Amino acid sequence: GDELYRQSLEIISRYLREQATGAKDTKPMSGATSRKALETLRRVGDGVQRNHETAFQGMLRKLDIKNEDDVKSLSRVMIHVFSDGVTNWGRIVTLISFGAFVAKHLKTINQESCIEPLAESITDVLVRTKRDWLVKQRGWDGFVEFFHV
Numbered sequence: 001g002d003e004l005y006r007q008s009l010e011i012i013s014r015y016l017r018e019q020a021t022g023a024k025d026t027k028p029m030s031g032a033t034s035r036k037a038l039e040t041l042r043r044v045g046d047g048v049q050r051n052h053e054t055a056f057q058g059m060l061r062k063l064d065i066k067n068e069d070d071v072k073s074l075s076r077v078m079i080h081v082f083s084d085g086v087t088n089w090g091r092i093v094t095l096i097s098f099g100a101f102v103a104k105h106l107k108t109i110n111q112e113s114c115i116e117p118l119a120e121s122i123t124d125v126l127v128r129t130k131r132d133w134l135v136k137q138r139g140w141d142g143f144v145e146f147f148h149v
């Protein structure tokens, strides 16, 4: 995906590590288009883990994530849930927020090494399945606008 992929991997990766563990990545992060996306994501996102906790918990249970090898096998189930039907920014937040929910879990069991791979995985599925649509919304820029004020 090049630019779209590089940008999405940064937003999602930082958001997931931010979610499990505190704290920002101080490194400046080819655009402030990314900073604006992280913040929109940070605010619209924290609700979702709240509201869907039971369901999220159930899904994680089925998944059985213990190690890095398990994270590498999640793509098919991840595409399965994501690509059915209608696309919107809200569905994307849900893909990303679960990813953050899964990421928190990864930390608890001291597998924080797995988070980067989880992010790569999520970004692959997002850009592969929804690429054309995303380009149409202008990508991350379209995202911040859709949720603005």
Ligand SMILES: Cc1cc(OCCCc2c(C(=O)O)[nH]c3cc(Cl)ccc23)cc(C)c1Cl
Residues within 6 Å of the ligand: 055, 056, 057, 059, 074, 077, 078, 081, 082, 091, 094, 095, 096, 098, 099, 102, 122
């Ligand atoms: C990181 C990650 C994200 C995923 O998101 C799939 C699409 C979002 C979604 C949707 C959805 O967009 O229809 N419904 C969900 C329900 C639960 Cl319990 C969890 C996620 C969703 C799905 C999986 C399996 C994984 Cl591992």
